[PDB]
Amino acid sequence: GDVEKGKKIFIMKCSQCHTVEKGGKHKTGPNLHGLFGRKTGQAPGYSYTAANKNKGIIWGEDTLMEYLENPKKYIPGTKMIFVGIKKKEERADLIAYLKKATNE
Ligand code: HEC
């Protein structure tokens, strides 16, 4: 995926509710640093729904591609109110940005 295009998607559609940087602040949604390879609902110091806490999957490319297409479908009961990203290539670019940004 294209990381720079993914960054612009992140800023436009996600940054209102999320930061990605290490030690970044929780906002409406959790800081996302360290997301990849982690269970759902584990960002330290964020108060999640039971749904997000209990989903019981591990975040990676496959699971983020599905979630970000339709969040409430993948995690019914979620308090992330976001319609989703329809285009596969947009999700892929965003996920590539996230894979870099949330690890560095
Ligand atoms: C834009 C496309 C994005 C991306 C990539 C993410 N979000 Fe959100 N998000 C929000 C809230 C309140 C939560 C917690 C939900 C709950 O507890 O039920 C989330 C959660 C996530 C996750 C899961 C994190 C985990 O640790 O399991 C992920 C991967 C995620 N978000 C990515 C709130 C918002 C928004 C508020 C209006 C918006 C906009 C977005 N999120 C957008 C995005």
- Looking from the CA of residue 47, the nearest atom of ligand 1 is 17
Range of the domain at 98: 1-104
Ligand 1: list residues with CB < 6 Å: 13-14, 16-18, 28-30, 35, 40-43, 48-49, 51-52, 68, 78-82, 85, 94
CATH number at residue 66: 1.10.760.10
Instruction: Report the number of distinct structural domains present in the chain.
Output: 1
> Phi first, then psi: what are they for 46, rounded to 5°?
-100, 135
Question: What's the CA dihedral at 79, 71, 3, 60 to 10 degrees?
Answer: 100
DSSP string, the chain: --HHHHHHHIIIIITTT---STTPPP-SS---TT-TTPBTT--TT----HHHHH---B-SHHHHHHHHH-HHHHSTT-S--------HHHHHHHHHHHHHHTT-
